[PDB]
DNA sequence: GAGAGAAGCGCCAAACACA
DNA sequence: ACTGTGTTTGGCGCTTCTCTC
DNA sequence: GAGAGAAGCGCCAAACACA
DNA sequence: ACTGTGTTTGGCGCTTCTCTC
């Protein structure tokens, strides 16, 4: 019998077929095995994409990176516009809620006032002071899933780009001051470099006529939920967990009960489809 | 009524025409501050959905739409000008005016626009009535008018020499007959945009245009309010041909005011840029008269 | 809300009119506050004016390097605690980053702007530099706005105040002559040239094969025309009733069907 | 001038083109900049592939992995045939040259005597005892580039496969003995599971008739050498080094002088093309 | 070399003849060494015979669990220090891993092979088990080969000796009746069945698009027929003069041109 | 000569034919241990390159090759058998014999082999001369002969009933006329492979083949040397049809030797497998006679 | 005189790293 | 609401041009 | 009677992890 | 000599089959 053979050896599809079974029965046996699905790291689910603004100064992404220069650890606060790609960056000595507020104000002066900003769960971003500052100018601030840097991917990418230019600027002349390098790099990024796919400059997109208005959006989501094996983003696990049933499914993530007490938001890339128990 | 996006496409064009026609009714804000509040609100709304819809769908504009939109613009814009009163005052009908300017601008540059259909629905009368509107006092009005006239001149081919002749006529009227005008700077921007695209050799008509209306424009007592733009236009001629600069410098030197005035520095500024381009090609033919005139 | 906006930025009534406030309540809010009651360049980034100004405080001084465009009035200001050619270079580079590269630069004589360092810095960027001996008004607006901000709250670190003042001057206040802000005047694209004897045809954008996000599909369904192109995504009509912003990774270049 | 602009700002191709330059000149300026090539991590070179036997028992790959089971750290010595994919594995308590010799002898008993074996530079593989054992049976043993596990990729892959089955076998019954699990897993891998691409079993390939003889090979290699920026495999470096000129180029690697004294073998994937100085 | 091979394995002269040695020098080497001077099953893996044997040493004992195929004589031996049903199960599983799953199993009564553990283990694999009361020759060959190995070198860990003895018995020695080794007899594929009234057509293999390794190409040049298929690579004729083993990642499935 | 792989393909076939023909010369190892050493070495080499080349190129075998290869095999293999001498002795010409068997095996199963070309170059005479060769004493000879005859029977269609009749004739001769044979086990393997592919219903000719030659083969004094394989063949008939097992068990019971002999266990072994398949289908018709015969 | 090498130019998937 | 992304790089298909029989 | 849903089956690129 | 690889998985194109107007 294929079922007992697979229960003993956990052989594959063709092994069950050669011992006598149709492709459908063998594939069903494979899909119904909890052991063969909790221990296989392979899975197949759709990809997620960060939310993008519909016009300039709609949604911004901000992050803090480090830079080593002449035995000095500079903290670079970077803000990027999710529509035009325009970048504002300031260099400081440490990281703090007050410095995040100062960088936000400088970015607003350089680019304009945004409607929403989304950042990771950094120590200086969930502080009460930052929330008060955002509410002062009526800026809605949300946070990503903790321990999931891909959700801030755009700004992360920008960080690398910025740092690369700095290295070039320090390869020719190691005695160049940090402020000069940062200003020249910002000028090059925003005014001189041309975006790869739209074949335009970030500054040109930022200040292009706003004549196209906003297309209307729909908050309609799927009303059905599924079962999922899951992995917690904070700590890497070798094998899947569950399966559990999603309380509610969003675009790019799902609400999964990790314990019997409270649930958690899990991105699509740490989830695996599960067969319905009933 | 019914929203245009919530109808089958079979009768969507008819609803678009109806929504065009329902905005043809006028609304006067200057008559009284409060009149037909809900009518004005629904007109503003409809203009908003129209400008939203026109810029998100393709193959939506066909033949039975082109003349009707022109009629709508003529009904909403072409009218007797407000009485002259010499910060400038703001037109009280600015909501509808701005929304309809936005709609017209988005309609004129749609990729589905065809230049073989507007040659029989837009003629010289429309463009004359549009050019007459530059005398408005609201600066935003003049800004939208400039950016509309630029597209109008760029798109059409049979209406270029006519507009050049008309701009020469209006310059003559402003410099000789009537001294009341305020759209001079926007017109100078349009001229600069047009003249940046000349080809070689320059025809004698452009030489006449330079020698007749542009240099004597320096004599206007209100030169300062449009001083920079004017200079720009001059710079764009002597770059195309450095040989034809002798009449320009001769006119600037001979008609330079011999009396002291605070605006003289204006001329000096212009001269600098001219000098910054005149040093090459061994241009010393009028260097001595220029120095003699500058010494005084 | 207009009240909070003025309480935080202290901009003019015509600035509030661009927001939800109407002229009458704009004037009411303007007079309800205790603290409130020629162009030589031809194009933006053509001629700049550079000044160094002393900002007075109760127990300290600041040195503000200010660059002002002679065409739009756009202002770039940077505060320092000393005055040297190096800080002049840094301020010029910061202003270039914020505004753009100027073609002609103008300033006064002094310990800075005259040493070989500043001259070499200008020649590296290919900027023509002229210096003369005698704008001072925008400096006054900056000073008075900073003073109002500090009077409202004495606990400010002098960088947030400068940033908010620059935002108010460049993005909030509107010019009287043209009813525009300095930012819009500076960064308004100019009209393209019009060739003679050659029609200006409308540019035709590209066609894309697309995939709908969140479906894990593997077949590109239909080539469509792009409405708008931005960084990170393009606007494609998924149906004849709605349009969606599809990311670049789900887009593939196509050819016109002909 | 494009050259001075790029020397100051290190802007991209389109920035130089918009300031006046042909595509050829801008691209040459980009390719000639040492700063823009020492600091860009992107590069474009061919991939390498492990050497494969031409018939069963020609080339083998061996490795040692760890397994945690009931508070016991078992060492799994794994040998895999590069032609048939057949696997022999033995479990031990520690790692030592003598245990490597014992595992080799057990693998020879299970599968046959190989001609060559290639393993990484493990402590128990470069020992004099292992070389003496290999010479005793006339087995040529070579070693990979140090700190480059990809060169042993096949056996590494096999390790993972093996461990996965063990986990399944321990998911159903945690009280199953280690030797039983290993024997059942070896039986499943070699006799029951079917290879993905050739649609056959490892045992079937191992014992298939040797009627096809060996195609003749050619040791002819390219006689020209190039310049390369390089990165040392042992330690990760942010920026490239060099460029130097290759003393001799092999298939998949090159000989590069790291210092003025001695050279080193560098795989293709840690090399970047360089323009000829003359 | 034949001398080293015999000095290490002590196999028969007919084993040396399969190597470079000829019969006369094979006999010379055979007699130059001091230490050297019916089938019940129908198919391989049909009936096995299982014995437990005591291997005697000077100061210790070993218990060898031996499984022998009744058709080919292939031997699987595992050494332990005790005797129980668990070790019988382990030895049976090891023999299954080395040889394959047997359909019928035969052994003697004892403390092992009779408890419920062994019975359950047999039923899990679906192996029919019969036990009887009275091969013992292959046990003797194993003993004498182990004794020769230990006499040659007394410093052996008893696992290397067993592995070398199994290698010598299964892969080196050749059977007298058929001039084959036990390994070849056990693992020789059987003849496929021949259907009646239906010709046995030759199987047609597949076509592949390929890329030459070490070129960084991006265009699949030509669909070719595969000569031989193995794990990790396939044999493709790159030209009309030579063939090469192309890896799977550089191969793409094609269709016959027709 | 010249290697086949180092020539243009235009004349490569001619060189292949020449290299085929140059190996047609015989070499007798039994005549004397040393004769034509370099000729033998070059023949062995050429056989090696031929077997290497045939299995690495496609579209290389065409019409003018098929009969010549058959002639080469006939010249190298078909000959008078060595004199009977009752470990078995090994043929001294084993190098060339093994290499040419390898070549023939690789040639017979090439994908370019066409079954419409060998029907006129290989006939019944060739297959009879091949089947006559099974009486060799070298076991490797018989192994290659078995694996060659399997392919020969599988590939051809018009030579199946003829070979069945010939195998019946040789079985009759072995069991009645001549008692000297040693290729019985390989032939039984061929029969098992052939009979595993029967279809239903079984024709009466196969029933005759069972009732005539297979059961009486149990009477041979040399049964043990081929005991297992024979049993296998029997097992493959009663599986196809459980109704036709009555004559088989009747013949096994009636012709069971009534005298004690060590080989009797052989029969017992066979009986077990028969029993292991005969319990279903309510087969108790001959259970009592079977028990009565087993009791004695 | 004219078709065969050579230069020019836009495009693309695979690598890469952002703590 | 929750969600990865933008730039670099050699190899090609393409178009246009120059030196040679 | 017959073409429209449904079940069956082989194939594939992207993810993945091997200290 | 030096060099990454094999398995898992949902989504599709394909072929064959069953229940309904
Ligand atoms: C939740 N709590 C309590 C905390 O303290 C949070 C501390 C904190 C805050 N910010 C962070 C990080 C951590 C962080 N590990 C990364 C980071 O790994 N980047 C590399 C990276 C990897 C993959 C990728 F696809 C893209 C990438 F950029 C990062 O980018 N940012 O911003
Ligand atoms: C040179 N000296 C002095 C030493 O001590 C060497 C110690 C030593 C010996 N063996 C090792 C390793 C280290 C080792 N780090 C790995 C290993 O990283 N695997 C993960 C892995 C990553 C990427 C990949 F593409 C494939 C992979 F498998 C490994 O597999 N093996 O075998
Ligand atoms: Mg980050
Ligand atoms: Mg290792
Ligand atoms: Mg490893
Ligand atoms: Zn399973
Ligand atoms: Zn106030
Ligand atoms: Zn560079
Ligand atoms: Zn010996």
Numbering used by the authors:
A (entry chain B), D (entry chain E): 3 to 280
B (entry chain C), F (entry chain F): 27 to 112, 124 to 333
C (entry chain A), E (entry chain D): 3 to 39, 52 to 148, 157 to 280
Sentences from the paper on this structure:
Integration of a DNA copy of the viral genome is an essential step in the replication of all retroviruses. The target of the INSTIs is the IN active site engaged with viral DNA (vDNA) ends in the context of the nucleoprotein complex termed the intasome. As in most transposases, the catalytic site is defined by the Asp-Asp-Glu catalytic triad (D65, D122 and E158 in HTLV and STLV INs), which coordinates two catalytically essential Mg2+ ions. The STLV-1 intasome:INSTI structures showed, as we previously reported, a twofold symmetric IN dimer of dimers with the two B56γ molecules that laterally flank the intasome.
XZ450 represents a class of INSTIs built on a naphthyridine-based backbone. XZ450 binds to the active site of the STLV intasome in a fashion similar to BIC. However, due to the presence of the 3-(dimethylamino)-3-oxopropyl substituent at position 6, it reaches much further along the active site. Y149 is shifted significantly closer to the drug, compared with its position in the RAL- and BIC-bound intasome structures. Overall, compounds XZ450, XZ446 and XZ448 exhibited the best characteristics, displaying IC50 values of 120.2 ± 36.1 nM, 115.4 ± 9.5 nM and 131.9 ± 29.7 nM, respectively, compared with 410 ± 78.5 nM of RAL. Based on our structural data, it is likely that if IN resistance mutations would occur in RAL-treated patients; these mutants would also be less efficiently inhibited by XZ450.
